[PDB]
Amino acid sequence: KPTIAAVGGYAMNNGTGTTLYTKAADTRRSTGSTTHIMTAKVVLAQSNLNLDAKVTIQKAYSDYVVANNASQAHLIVGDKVTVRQLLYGLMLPSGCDAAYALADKYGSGSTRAARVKSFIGKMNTAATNLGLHNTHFDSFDGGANYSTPRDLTKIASSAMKNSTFRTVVKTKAYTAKTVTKTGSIRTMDTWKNTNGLLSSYSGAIGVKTGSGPEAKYCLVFAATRGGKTVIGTVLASTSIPARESDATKIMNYGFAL
Ligand SMILES: [Cl-]
Ligand code: NA
């Protein structure tokens, strides 16, 4: 059994559900940007989902990232961006502006505030339907926003059942071509997936990085080797390189078990 820096860790065989590794696997901690996983999951499960539906980037999404020093996809105010493009913006560069846009689009309500609240409600309902008990969301991008290595792994496993989600999280780079106010096509700066495992770990296929002042360095990981898929989560590691290493050790351990 490997030693990891993270104070929370968990891994299982995605196909069988069998646990492969645990470390305070059911201890509630802050999730940071790993919350984006649930946001993507909820969006992809919407009955009225249209990946090609366009959303206009509101001034509010931009002001929000600045006011909260949040990670962003650099969405330009006035631009028309599709739900698909927003999903890449959410999962690769950890775009909280993309998260805001998606919550605004799929939440139910007459105001942005009402729709954001409704969307967060859907996130909690989603956790409930998964039979989770140690997860609560109070945001769409990450004290009332917490989870555990086990719960987050279950959430990710559920999301991975969607082919679109799988396609997005295994993508290393994506360049969105958005529609300008004048109707022209803008080639945005390329988005790179913040998950270094995609390039450092052979067989890596997901899932999502996360960080925060309270959550520290987190990472939900997945990889396939020899027809076996290991999926897991590390919470509160000490650095970006440390979280990547923690995940690498856990997956290597899980594959060798
Ligand atoms: Cl991060
Ligand atoms: Na992140």
XYZ file of N, CA and C and ligand atoms in Angstrom:
773
model
N 0.852 -1.225 0.000
C 0.000 0.000 0.000
C 0.873 1.255 0.000
N 0.672 2.132 -0.992
C 1.452 3.367 -1.096
C 1.134 4.422 -0.038
N 2.105 5.299 0.183
C 1.982 6.394 1.123
C 1.695 7.627 0.262
N 0.692 8.413 0.637
C 0.367 9.606 -0.138
C 0.321 10.850 0.738
N 0.512 12.008 0.111
C 0.481 13.286 0.817
C -0.955 13.700 1.155
N -1.900 13.341 0.288
C -3.305 13.684 0.500
C -3.814 13.119 1.819
N -4.663 13.872 2.508
C -5.204 13.388 3.771
C -6.491 12.602 3.531
N -6.912 12.566 2.269
C -8.097 11.828 1.889
C -7.837 11.133 0.566
N -8.135 9.839 0.496
C -7.917 9.112 -0.743
C -8.835 7.917 -0.902
N -9.119 7.558 -2.150
C -9.976 6.408 -2.452
C -9.841 5.974 -3.909
N -9.926 4.670 -4.145
C -9.871 4.140 -5.501
C -10.636 2.827 -5.565
N -11.288 2.590 -6.698
C -12.041 1.367 -6.912
C -11.932 0.927 -8.371
N -12.333 -0.316 -8.608
C -12.369 -0.880 -9.947
C -13.702 -0.318 -10.447
N -13.639 0.548 -11.452
C -14.841 1.173 -11.980
C -15.899 0.203 -12.482
N -15.461 -0.917 -13.043
C -16.407 -1.882 -13.562
C -17.105 -2.748 -12.522
N -16.412 -3.072 -11.435
C -16.981 -3.942 -10.409
C -17.411 -3.255 -9.122
N -16.860 -2.072 -8.868
C -17.192 -1.345 -7.655
C -16.304 -1.735 -6.484
N -15.447 -2.732 -6.689
C -14.557 -3.192 -5.627
C -13.498 -2.159 -5.231
N -13.397 -1.910 -3.927
C -12.440 -0.951 -3.388
C -11.020 -1.471 -3.532
N -10.113 -0.583 -3.929
C -8.713 -0.938 -4.116
C -7.798 -0.165 -3.174
N -8.271 0.978 -2.687
C -7.465 1.814 -1.806
C -8.315 2.769 -0.961
N -7.925 2.954 0.293
C -8.649 3.865 1.165
C -7.717 4.611 2.117
N -8.096 5.846 2.420
C -7.383 6.702 3.370
C -8.405 7.769 3.745
N -9.022 7.611 4.915
C -10.052 8.544 5.363
C -11.040 8.725 4.206
N -11.341 7.619 3.531
C -12.231 7.613 2.373
C -13.623 8.209 2.581
N -14.096 8.245 3.826
C -15.418 8.794 4.104
C -15.403 10.052 4.977
N -14.255 10.715 5.031
C -14.118 11.935 5.809
C -14.416 13.136 4.905
N -15.396 13.935 5.312
C -15.811 15.118 4.563
C -14.731 16.191 4.520
N -14.492 16.714 3.321
C -13.501 17.760 3.105
C -14.006 18.659 1.983
N -13.359 19.806 1.813
C -13.727 20.745 0.755
C -13.314 20.159 -0.598
N -14.117 20.416 -1.624
C -13.855 19.862 -2.954
C -13.165 20.792 -3.953
N -13.333 22.097 -3.762
C -12.736 23.036 -4.688
C -13.352 22.828 -6.060
N -12.526 22.933 -7.092
C -12.986 22.785 -8.463
C -13.376 21.367 -8.911
N -13.254 20.365 -8.043
C -13.661 19.020 -8.451
C -15.197 19.007 -8.534
N -15.820 20.038 -7.958
C -17.271 20.199 -7.967
C -17.762 20.281 -9.418
N -16.921 20.834 -10.289
C -17.246 20.966 -11.708
C -17.741 19.632 -12.287
N -17.245 18.520 -11.746
C -17.662 17.204 -12.215
C -19.181 17.041 -12.082
N -19.724 17.396 -10.917
C -21.157 17.272 -10.699
C -21.921 18.211 -11.631
N -21.376 19.407 -11.853
C -22.014 20.380 -12.736
C -22.150 19.775 -14.136
N -21.064 19.203 -14.646
C -21.081 18.564 -15.962
C -22.107 17.425 -15.967
N -22.069 16.601 -14.920
C -22.983 15.467 -14.796
C -24.451 15.896 -14.870
N -24.801 16.938 -14.123
C -26.171 17.432 -14.104
C -26.585 17.954 -15.479
N -25.704 18.727 -16.106
C -25.986 19.288 -17.423
C -26.252 18.167 -18.427
N -25.365 17.179 -18.448
C -25.477 16.071 -19.384
C -26.697 15.182 -19.166
N -27.311 15.289 -17.992
C -28.495 14.496 -17.666
C -29.802 15.266 -17.880
N -29.708 16.531 -18.285
C -30.902 17.339 -18.515
C -31.735 16.770 -19.659
N -33.050 16.742 -19.474
C -33.954 16.217 -20.493
C -33.956 17.127 -21.718
N -33.821 18.424 -21.473
C -33.814 19.415 -22.537
C -32.399 19.731 -23.025
N -31.480 18.786 -22.863
C -30.102 19.007 -23.287
C -29.914 19.104 -24.802
N -29.157 20.116 -25.215
C -28.829 20.341 -26.616
C -27.390 20.840 -26.635
N -26.464 19.939 -26.935
C -25.049 20.275 -26.966
C -24.759 21.433 -27.915
N -25.604 21.605 -28.922
C -25.393 22.668 -29.895
C -26.089 23.968 -29.529
N -26.854 23.959 -28.441
C -27.541 25.169 -28.003
C -26.486 26.227 -27.678
N -26.730 27.459 -28.117
C -25.798 28.548 -27.868
C -26.215 29.372 -26.658
N -25.216 29.856 -25.933
C -25.425 30.661 -24.738
C -24.630 31.947 -24.950
N -25.199 33.091 -24.577
C -24.481 34.353 -24.723
C -23.705 34.601 -23.445
N -22.412 34.870 -23.579
C -21.585 35.118 -22.411
C -22.000 36.434 -21.770
N -22.529 36.341 -20.554
C -22.981 37.510 -19.807
C -21.834 38.216 -19.080
N -21.981 39.526 -18.910
C -20.983 40.334 -18.220
C -20.757 39.761 -16.820
N -21.826 39.207 -16.245
C -21.796 38.625 -14.902
C -20.819 37.461 -14.756
N -20.675 36.651 -15.800
C -19.766 35.512 -15.729
C -18.348 36.023 -15.606
N -18.058 37.104 -16.322
C -16.729 37.699 -16.306
C -16.422 38.405 -14.987
N -17.368 39.213 -14.518
C -17.185 39.944 -13.273
C -16.998 38.963 -12.116
N -17.701 37.839 -12.206
C -17.650 36.789 -11.199
C -16.250 36.210 -11.048
N -15.640 35.795 -12.153
C -14.302 35.218 -12.071
C -13.313 36.208 -11.451
N -13.408 37.475 -11.843
C -12.516 38.502 -11.310
C -12.743 38.733 -9.814
N -14.005 38.883 -9.426
C -14.354 39.124 -8.032
C -13.988 37.966 -7.102
N -13.888 36.757 -7.647
C -13.566 35.589 -6.834
C -12.206 34.989 -7.143
N -11.432 35.664 -7.983
C -10.114 35.165 -8.360
C -10.259 33.687 -8.728
N -11.287 33.387 -9.513
C -11.564 32.017 -9.912
C -10.893 31.600 -11.215
N -10.661 30.295 -11.352
C -10.075 29.740 -12.565
C -11.084 30.040 -13.665
N -10.607 30.239 -14.888
C -11.521 30.575 -15.972
C -11.146 30.041 -17.351
N -12.127 30.057 -18.244
C -11.944 29.605 -19.614
C -11.782 30.837 -20.513
N -11.743 32.018 -19.895
C -11.584 33.285 -20.608
C -12.692 33.559 -21.621
N -13.919 33.212 -21.258
C -15.051 33.446 -22.145
C -15.225 34.959 -22.309
N -15.464 35.390 -23.542
C -15.607 36.807 -23.873
C -17.052 37.277 -23.851
N -17.306 38.338 -23.094
C -18.652 38.880 -22.969
C -19.232 39.272 -24.319
N -20.435 38.781 -24.594
C -21.091 39.072 -25.854
C -21.033 37.896 -26.813
N -20.017 37.052 -26.660
C -19.850 35.890 -27.528
C -20.965 34.867 -27.348
N -21.173 34.052 -28.374
C -22.166 32.988 -28.330
C -21.347 31.705 -28.290
N -21.516 30.952 -27.211
C -20.783 29.713 -26.989
C -21.763 28.552 -26.802
N -21.487 27.418 -27.442
C -22.375 26.263 -27.331
C -22.202 25.533 -26.003
N -23.183 24.712 -25.651
C -23.106 23.957 -24.413
C -21.893 23.033 -24.467
N -21.649 22.439 -25.631
C -20.507 21.554 -25.800
C -19.208 22.314 -25.511
N -19.062 23.497 -26.099
C -17.869 24.300 -25.873
C -17.742 24.652 -24.397
N -18.872 24.925 -23.741
C -18.868 25.269 -22.318
C -18.421 24.074 -21.483
N -18.789 22.868 -21.904
C -18.380 21.680 -21.157
C -16.861 21.497 -21.231
N -16.263 21.831 -22.372
C -14.810 21.741 -22.512
C -14.170 22.847 -21.669
N -14.783 24.033 -21.680
C -14.265 25.155 -20.914
C -14.338 24.902 -19.417
N -15.337 24.132 -19.017
C -15.525 23.792 -17.616
C -14.502 22.755 -17.142
N -14.371 21.676 -17.910
C -13.493 20.564 -17.551
C -12.002 20.642 -17.866
N -11.601 21.420 -18.867
C -10.179 21.477 -19.183
C -9.436 22.555 -18.383
N -9.737 23.847 -18.611
C -9.033 24.871 -17.836
C -9.749 25.148 -16.510
N -10.688 24.283 -16.134
C -11.422 24.455 -14.873
C -12.186 25.787 -14.828
N -12.846 26.122 -15.937
C -13.574 27.376 -16.042
C -14.794 27.584 -15.162
N -14.669 28.472 -14.181
C -15.787 28.778 -13.290
C -16.778 29.697 -14.000
N -16.307 30.403 -15.036
C -17.196 31.252 -15.820
C -18.062 30.306 -16.670
N -17.457 29.220 -17.152
C -18.185 28.227 -17.933
C -19.205 27.551 -16.997
N -18.787 27.291 -15.757
C -19.670 26.674 -14.764
C -20.878 27.582 -14.529
N -20.608 28.876 -14.365
C -21.652 29.866 -14.135
C -22.618 29.869 -15.318
N -22.068 29.876 -16.529
C -22.890 29.879 -17.737
C -23.808 28.658 -17.798
N -23.265 27.488 -17.473
C -24.041 26.256 -17.514
C -25.144 26.243 -16.464
N -24.849 26.769 -15.278
C -25.839 26.832 -14.202
C -26.971 27.778 -14.600
N -26.596 28.895 -15.212
C -27.547 29.901 -15.660
C -28.457 29.302 -16.731
N -27.860 28.542 -17.636
C -28.599 27.930 -18.720
C -29.558 26.816 -18.299
N -29.107 25.923 -17.422
C -29.949 24.797 -17.044
C -30.700 24.858 -15.726
N -30.494 25.921 -14.963
C -31.237 26.069 -13.728
C -32.623 26.561 -14.120
N -33.613 26.344 -13.259
C -34.986 26.781 -13.514
C -35.239 28.088 -12.750
N -35.751 29.108 -13.433
C -36.006 30.369 -12.762
C -36.057 31.545 -13.712
N -36.616 32.655 -13.244
C -36.762 33.846 -14.069
C -35.585 34.817 -13.999
N -34.693 34.611 -13.030
C -33.495 35.445 -12.892
C -32.288 34.522 -12.851
N -31.116 35.104 -13.066
C -29.875 34.354 -13.036
C -29.702 33.807 -11.618
N -30.022 34.629 -10.622
C -29.906 34.230 -9.219
C -30.796 33.029 -8.919
N -32.032 33.071 -9.397
C -32.969 31.974 -9.184
C -32.505 30.697 -9.891
N -32.010 30.835 -11.116
C -31.553 29.673 -11.865
C -30.296 29.047 -11.249
N -29.422 29.872 -10.684
C -28.210 29.361 -10.049
C -28.613 28.527 -8.826
N -29.549 29.050 -8.041
C -30.032 28.348 -6.858
C -30.669 27.021 -7.264
N -31.520 27.071 -8.280
C -32.185 25.878 -8.775
C -31.142 24.851 -9.243
N -30.146 25.308 -10.002
C -29.113 24.404 -10.494
C -28.370 23.718 -9.349
N -28.029 24.477 -8.311
C -27.333 23.893 -7.167
C -28.262 22.866 -6.500
N -29.569 23.122 -6.556
C -30.521 22.180 -5.990
C -30.451 20.863 -6.751
N -30.332 20.953 -8.078
C -30.240 19.771 -8.929
C -28.983 18.956 -8.610
N -27.896 19.653 -8.280
C -26.630 19.004 -7.947
C -26.818 18.171 -6.686
N -27.514 18.737 -5.708
C -27.763 18.028 -4.458
C -28.728 16.869 -4.669
N -29.725 17.064 -5.523
C -30.671 15.992 -5.816
C -29.901 14.846 -6.479
N -28.970 15.201 -7.364
C -28.155 14.212 -8.063
C -27.355 13.351 -7.076
N -26.784 13.986 -6.054
C -26.005 13.273 -5.045
C -26.935 12.342 -4.272
N -28.116 12.847 -3.947
C -29.124 12.070 -3.239
C -29.510 10.825 -4.044
N -29.764 11.005 -5.335
C -30.148 9.888 -6.183
C -29.052 8.848 -6.339
N -27.813 9.229 -6.039
C -26.680 8.308 -6.130
C -26.520 7.573 -4.806
N -27.383 7.904 -3.847
C -27.329 7.272 -2.541
C -26.205 7.788 -1.659
N -25.726 8.994 -1.946
C -24.640 9.589 -1.171
C -25.150 10.228 0.115
N -24.299 10.255 1.133
C -24.677 10.826 2.415
C -23.678 11.831 2.963
N -22.495 11.891 2.363
C -21.457 12.798 2.846
C -21.069 13.882 1.870
N -22.015 14.231 1.008
C -21.804 15.245 -0.009
C -22.879 16.332 0.005
N -22.455 17.587 -0.051
C -23.401 18.686 -0.142
C -22.784 19.790 -0.981
N -23.590 20.367 -1.863
C -23.115 21.433 -2.727
C -23.794 22.740 -2.373
N -23.012 23.809 -2.409
C -23.501 25.141 -2.119
C -23.015 26.071 -3.230
N -22.513 25.476 -4.305
C -21.994 26.235 -5.437
C -21.966 25.362 -6.685
N -21.683 25.976 -7.833
C -21.601 25.234 -9.085
C -20.141 25.053 -9.497
N -19.228 25.629 -8.722
C -17.806 25.547 -9.045
C -16.884 25.314 -7.846
N -17.456 25.060 -6.675
C -16.630 24.822 -5.498
C -16.138 26.080 -4.795
N -18.391 26.217 3.766
C -18.589 25.108 4.681
C -19.642 24.119 4.214
N -20.598 24.580 3.412
C -21.660 23.703 2.928
C -21.341 23.027 1.597
N -20.115 23.190 1.106
C -19.715 22.546 -0.144
C -18.637 21.537 0.204
N -19.045 20.288 0.362
C -18.098 19.261 0.740
C -18.460 17.903 0.166
N -17.500 16.990 0.252
C -17.663 15.615 -0.202
C -16.567 14.764 0.445
N -16.423 13.532 -0.030
C -15.404 12.627 0.477
C -14.751 11.945 -0.720
N -13.576 11.336 -0.512
C -12.918 10.653 -1.630
C -13.838 9.583 -2.224
N -14.575 8.875 -1.367
C -15.474 7.840 -1.859
C -16.654 8.429 -2.625
N -17.329 9.412 -2.037
C -18.490 10.032 -2.690
C -18.133 10.634 -4.050
N -17.060 11.421 -4.097
C -16.637 12.040 -5.354
C -16.285 10.982 -6.403
N -15.709 9.867 -5.968
C -15.366 8.792 -6.897
C -16.663 8.200 -7.474
N -17.689 8.067 -6.639
C -18.966 7.532 -7.094
C -19.589 8.498 -8.099
N -19.455 9.792 -7.823
C -20.008 10.812 -8.704
C -19.323 10.740 -10.067
N -17.999 10.657 -10.049
C -17.214 10.569 -11.274
C -17.550 9.293 -12.045
N -17.689 8.182 -11.331
C -18.020 6.912 -11.970
C -19.363 7.060 -12.682
N -20.305 7.737 -12.033
C -21.622 7.949 -12.624
C -21.523 8.812 -13.883
N -20.744 9.887 -13.801
C -20.560 10.785 -14.938
C -19.899 10.062 -16.115
N -18.944 9.186 -15.818
C -18.235 8.464 -16.874
C -19.129 7.533 -17.686
N -20.369 7.344 -17.245
C -21.299 6.487 -17.978
C -21.764 7.213 -19.245
N -21.540 8.526 -19.274
C -21.911 9.364 -20.408
C -20.720 9.483 -21.361
N -20.923 9.111 -22.629
C -19.853 9.160 -23.630
C -19.312 10.563 -23.872
N -20.188 11.564 -23.820
C -19.761 12.947 -24.013
C -18.807 13.316 -22.874
N -19.197 12.997 -21.640
C -18.344 13.286 -20.488
C -16.976 12.613 -20.656
N -16.985 11.350 -21.076
C -15.748 10.599 -21.283
C -14.872 11.269 -22.342
N -15.502 11.696 -23.428
C -14.774 12.340 -24.511
C -14.101 13.614 -24.031
N -14.848 14.422 -23.287
C -14.331 15.680 -22.779
C -13.158 15.529 -21.813
N -13.330 14.731 -20.756
C -12.272 14.593 -19.756
C -10.972 13.933 -20.207
N -10.989 13.227 -21.335
C -9.753 12.621 -21.814
C -9.052 13.535 -22.836
N -9.675 14.672 -23.144
C -9.110 15.630 -24.100
C -8.035 16.508 -23.460
N -6.847 16.492 -24.058
C -5.708 17.256 -23.571
C -5.744 18.725 -23.974
N -6.251 18.994 -25.169
C -6.315 20.359 -25.665
C -7.557 20.565 -26.521
N -8.156 21.743 -26.398
C -9.352 22.081 -27.158
C -9.319 23.570 -27.494
N -9.656 23.901 -28.738
C -9.677 25.288 -29.196
C -11.085 25.624 -29.668
N -11.801 26.427 -28.886
C -13.162 26.807 -29.230
C -13.229 27.927 -30.267
N -14.104 27.751 -31.252
C -14.336 28.751 -32.290
C -15.727 29.272 -31.956
N -15.777 30.447 -31.339
C -17.039 31.041 -30.919
C -17.607 32.082 -31.886
N -18.855 32.473 -31.656
C -19.483 33.463 -32.515
C -19.518 34.823 -31.843
N -18.887 35.756 -32.528
C -18.736 37.129 -32.125
C -20.046 37.930 -32.183
N -20.039 39.108 -31.557
C -21.201 39.993 -31.543
C -21.571 40.385 -32.965
N -20.562 40.549 -33.810
C -20.786 40.915 -35.198
C -21.104 39.696 -36.047
N -21.120 38.528 -35.412
C -21.424 37.305 -36.129
C -20.216 36.595 -36.702
N -19.034 37.162 -36.498
C -17.818 36.551 -37.009
C -17.411 35.369 -36.129
N -16.510 34.533 -36.640
C -16.039 33.379 -35.882
C -14.713 33.725 -35.234
N -14.666 33.601 -33.915
C -13.457 33.902 -33.179
C -12.746 32.630 -32.742
N -11.451 32.550 -33.013
C -10.681 31.396 -32.575
C -10.112 31.794 -31.216
N -10.628 31.172 -30.166
C -10.158 31.471 -28.823
C -8.779 30.854 -28.599
N -8.086 31.317 -27.566
C -6.790 30.750 -27.224
C -7.105 29.304 -26.820
N -6.227 28.375 -27.174
C -6.433 26.966 -26.858
C -6.472 26.666 -25.359
N -7.395 25.786 -24.982
C -7.552 25.346 -23.597
C -6.770 24.047 -23.439
N -6.022 23.942 -22.345
C -5.240 22.749 -22.037
C -5.854 22.119 -20.788
N -5.941 20.794 -20.767
C -6.490 20.109 -19.606
C -5.485 20.227 -18.466
N -5.962 20.697 -17.317
C -5.127 20.875 -16.137
C -4.689 19.542 -15.511
N -5.307 18.445 -15.942
C -4.963 17.128 -15.410
C -3.713 16.573 -16.087
N -2.569 16.736 -15.429
C -1.313 16.246 -15.977
C -1.231 14.743 -16.229
N -2.083 13.956 -15.575
C -2.066 12.503 -15.760
C -2.342 12.102 -17.200
N -3.125 12.912 -17.904
C -3.455 12.609 -19.293
C -2.186 12.429 -20.130
N -1.123 13.132 -19.758
C 0.131 13.033 -20.492
C 1.230 12.252 -19.765
N 1.142 12.164 -18.439
C 2.157 11.461 -17.657
C 1.846 10.008 -17.313
N 0.568 9.668 -17.211
C 0.184 8.302 -16.863
C -0.425 7.525 -18.034
N 0.270 6.476 -18.455
C -0.188 5.654 -19.560
C -1.529 5.021 -19.230
N -2.492 5.206 -20.125
C -3.816 4.657 -19.922
C -4.765 5.609 -19.211
N -4.275 6.787 -18.825
C -5.117 7.764 -18.130
C -6.269 8.214 -19.022
N -7.460 8.346 -18.444
C -8.639 8.756 -19.210
C -9.487 9.841 -18.542
N -9.086 10.278 -17.353
C -9.840 11.301 -16.641
C -9.190 11.600 -15.303
N -9.837 12.383 -14.439
C -11.161 12.943 -14.689
C -11.203 14.460 -14.499
N -10.785 14.944 -13.327
C -10.813 16.382 -13.052
C -9.976 16.800 -11.849
N -9.221 17.881 -12.031
C -8.380 18.449 -10.988
C -9.256 19.375 -10.144
N -8.706 19.834 -9.028
C -9.433 20.746 -8.169
C -8.488 21.339 -7.149
N -8.752 22.566 -6.725
C -7.910 23.209 -5.724
C -8.702 24.311 -5.042
N -8.165 24.817 -3.937
C -8.833 25.875 -3.212
C -8.114 26.147 -1.911
N -8.393 27.292 -1.263
C -7.755 27.656 0.003
C -8.072 26.652 1.103
N -9.274 26.082 1.055
C -9.679 25.100 2.057
C -9.527 23.662 1.558
N -9.746 23.451 0.262
C -9.647 22.114 -0.321
C -8.217 21.663 -0.599
N -7.304 22.623 -0.730
C -5.912 22.324 -1.053
C -5.879 21.690 -2.445
N -4.939 20.782 -2.682
C -4.809 20.167 -4.001
C -5.485 18.816 -4.168
N -6.529 18.823 -4.988
C -7.334 17.640 -5.238
C -7.281 17.135 -6.675
N -7.628 15.863 -6.836
C -7.614 15.251 -8.146
C -8.449 13.978 -8.193
N -9.381 13.942 -9.140
C -10.216 12.770 -9.373
C -9.563 12.172 -10.615
N -9.126 10.923 -10.499
C -8.409 10.255 -11.574
C -9.041 8.965 -12.066
N -8.685 8.585 -13.289
C -9.178 7.351 -13.896
C -8.171 6.914 -14.955
N -8.008 5.607 -15.102
C -7.087 5.053 -16.086
C -7.480 3.614 -16.406
N -7.143 3.178 -17.615
C -7.452 1.825 -18.048
C -6.170 1.119 -18.458
N -5.957 -0.069 -17.903
C -4.774 -0.864 -18.217
C -5.167 -2.343 -18.217
N -4.951 -3.006 -19.348
C -5.292 -4.412 -19.449
C -6.773 -4.677 -19.248
N -7.620 -3.841 -19.846
C -9.057 -4.019 -19.719
C -9.585 -3.832 -18.304
N -8.842 -3.088 -17.492
C -9.232 -2.815 -16.113
C -9.216 -1.304 -15.922
N -10.295 -0.755 -15.379
C -10.358 0.681 -15.159
C -10.351 1.029 -13.678
N -9.344 1.795 -13.273
C -9.207 2.235 -11.892
C -9.666 3.690 -11.836
N -10.594 3.985 -10.930
C -11.095 5.343 -10.769
C -10.971 5.698 -9.292
N -10.522 6.914 -9.008
C -10.354 7.323 -7.625
C -10.275 8.822 -7.420
N -10.058 9.218 -6.171
C -9.981 10.626 -5.791
C -9.013 10.852 -4.638
N -8.244 11.933 -4.719
C -7.371 12.310 -3.622
C -7.826 13.723 -3.264
N -7.964 13.987 -1.971
C -8.388 15.295 -1.502
C -7.353 15.845 -0.537
N -7.101 17.141 -0.653
C -6.159 17.828 0.212
C -4.715 17.322 0.165
N -4.174 17.197 -1.040
C -2.777 16.831 -1.182
C -2.063 18.176 -0.976
N -0.740 18.156 -0.939
C 0.041 19.357 -0.670
C 0.486 20.248 -1.830
N 0.380 19.750 -3.055
C 0.781 20.531 -4.217
C 0.261 19.873 -5.478
N 0.445 20.542 -6.607
C -0.002 19.985 -7.868
C 0.849 18.742 -8.184
N 2.189 18.863 -8.135
C 2.982 17.660 -8.427
C 2.682 16.527 -7.427
N 2.422 16.881 -6.168
C 2.127 15.880 -5.141
C 0.816 15.141 -5.415
N -0.207 15.872 -5.843
C -1.487 15.247 -6.124
C -1.381 14.315 -7.327
N -0.554 14.679 -8.304
C -0.378 13.843 -9.491
C 0.345 12.563 -9.100
N 1.315 12.706 -8.206
C 2.096 11.575 -7.728
C 1.246 10.659 -6.837
N 0.399 11.256 -6.002
C -0.477 10.493 -5.117
C -1.359 9.610 -5.988
N -1.976 10.220 -6.995
C -2.849 9.488 -7.909
C -2.086 8.398 -8.660
N -0.873 8.708 -9.100
C -0.083 7.729 -9.828
C 0.195 6.484 -8.978
N 0.555 6.705 -7.721
C 0.852 5.607 -6.814
C -0.383 4.761 -6.538
N -1.515 5.418 -6.313
C -2.751 4.694 -6.037
C -3.187 3.847 -7.233
N -3.095 4.406 -8.435
C -3.484 3.653 -9.619
C -2.525 2.478 -9.844
N -1.223 2.726 -9.714
C -0.234 1.663 -9.897
C -0.514 0.536 -8.896
N -0.833 0.924 -7.666
C -1.143 -0.027 -6.608
C -2.391 -0.820 -6.989
N -3.440 -0.099 -7.384
C -4.691 -0.729 -7.764
C -4.553 -1.713 -8.912
N -3.700 -1.393 -9.881
C -3.492 -2.269 -11.031
C -2.677 -3.511 -10.676
N -1.819 -3.388 -9.667
C -0.960 -4.490 -9.243
C -1.602 -5.425 -8.215
N -2.728 -5.000 -7.652
C -3.433 -5.776 -6.631
C -3.872 -7.166 -7.061
Cl -6.291 23.001 -9.580
Na -8.622 22.806 -11.113
